[PDB]
């Protein structure tokens, strides 16, 4: 339907079943609903590890960069995923959260050795 | 090079219904439409207003219409291009000779 404004956006549409999520990577208008209408489906992301311990991500790279080439904005988890692929640089927050996690592990290690005493 | 009409009709051929208006011919265009139940083709008829500059059109003439790039009015989206068959006077496009119905008025084998 006709909107006032808003942009082309590549995001995650949530397809799925209760406690079993799945994501369709999607080229969408920004103002239309999440799971709703879309311009084009780009790829898919399975959050749950399968039989082989794998989260499956499929990305149509030609069309992805066609749309970024048309000025489409990426969502933060879309960014995180493209960076995880190596199609994009690692998002700064991936790295920052990695560091925060490392420091949490360090302080929990020290707290473990302090409580053991 | 932009000259266009948004109309699907760009080239049509139709009969001349009536000449009543000034410089405008009313023209019945007839197409074959497929009746989906019977799977058979019937003639749907539709009228078009065409611009006739010289008021060249008798009633009954078979006529070609070219789409107007800019609409003259709401009802006139077409212009009369050629008169394909003049009514009661017809020159056979194949042999270039005058004919009344299925008969030749002037024999094509008698040049001189």
């Amino acid at each position: 339907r006709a909107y006032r404004g808003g942009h082309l956006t590549i995001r995650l549409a949530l397809g799925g079943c209760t406690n079993r999520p799945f994501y369709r990577i999607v080229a969408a208008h920004s103002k239309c609903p999440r799971d709703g209408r879309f311009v084009e489906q780009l790829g898919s992301y399975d959050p749950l590890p399968n039989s082989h311990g794998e989260k499956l991500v499929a990305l149509n790279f030609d069309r992805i960069r066609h749309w970024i080439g048309c000025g489409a904005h990426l969502s933060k988890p879309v960014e995180k995923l493209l960076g995880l692929s190596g199609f994009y640089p690692l998002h700064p927050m991936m790295i920052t959260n990695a560091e925060r996690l490392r420091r949490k592990r360090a302080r929990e290690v020290l707290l473990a050795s302090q409580k053991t005493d | 090079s932009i000259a266009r009409s948004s109309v699907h009709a760009k080239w049509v051929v139709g009969k001349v219904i009536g000449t009543a208006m000034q410089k405008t011919a009313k023209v019945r265009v007839t197409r074959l439409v497929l009746d989906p139940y019977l799977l058979k083709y019937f003639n749907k008829r539709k009228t078009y207003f065409a611009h006739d500059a010289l008021q060249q059109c008798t009633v009954g003439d078979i006529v070609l219409l070219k789409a107007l790039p800019v609409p003259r009015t709401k009802h006139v989206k077409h212009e009369l291009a050629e008169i394909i068959f003049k009514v009661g006077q017809v020159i056979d496009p194949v042999t270039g000779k005058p004919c009344a119905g299925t008969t030749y008025l002037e024999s094509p084998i008698s040049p001189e």
Binding site: - | D35, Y37, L38, K40, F42
Partner: protein, 109 residues
């Protein structure tokens, strides 16, 4: 007919269902105006137990009470359903037994 005529009329279309006594609803709530008795049609005879009711749609209608024996007085509220009683001409409705003021038939004691 010919093909032309069959094209002119279009394919035959099934007419929508004419609506009956309960006006397309599965049941209707109504209050009992009067209780009386009706003789069936000629081939077979009894005297059937009926009531007159006013229904939520405002239409007043004759209605039939199934089972042997019943307790119904004026003002009682009942639920009626679509079943047509064959003996009784003109009676298209039936009291639902075991709802509101009409209880299930009591086993003989």
């Amino acid at each position: 007919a010919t093909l032309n005529q069959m094209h002119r009329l279009g394919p035959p279309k099934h007419p929508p269902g004419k609506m009956g006594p309960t006006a397309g609803r599965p049941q209707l709530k109504g209050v009992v105006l009067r209780t009386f008795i009706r003789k069936p049609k000629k081939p077979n005879s009894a005297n059937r137990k009926c009531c007159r009711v006013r229904l939520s749609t405002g239409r007043e209608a004759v209605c039939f009470i199934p089972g042997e024996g019943h307790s119904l007085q004026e003002h009682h509220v009942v639920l009626v359903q679509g079943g047509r009683t064959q003996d009784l001409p003109g009676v298209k409705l039936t009291v639902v037994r075991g709802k509101y003021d009409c209880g299930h038939v009591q086993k003989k004691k």
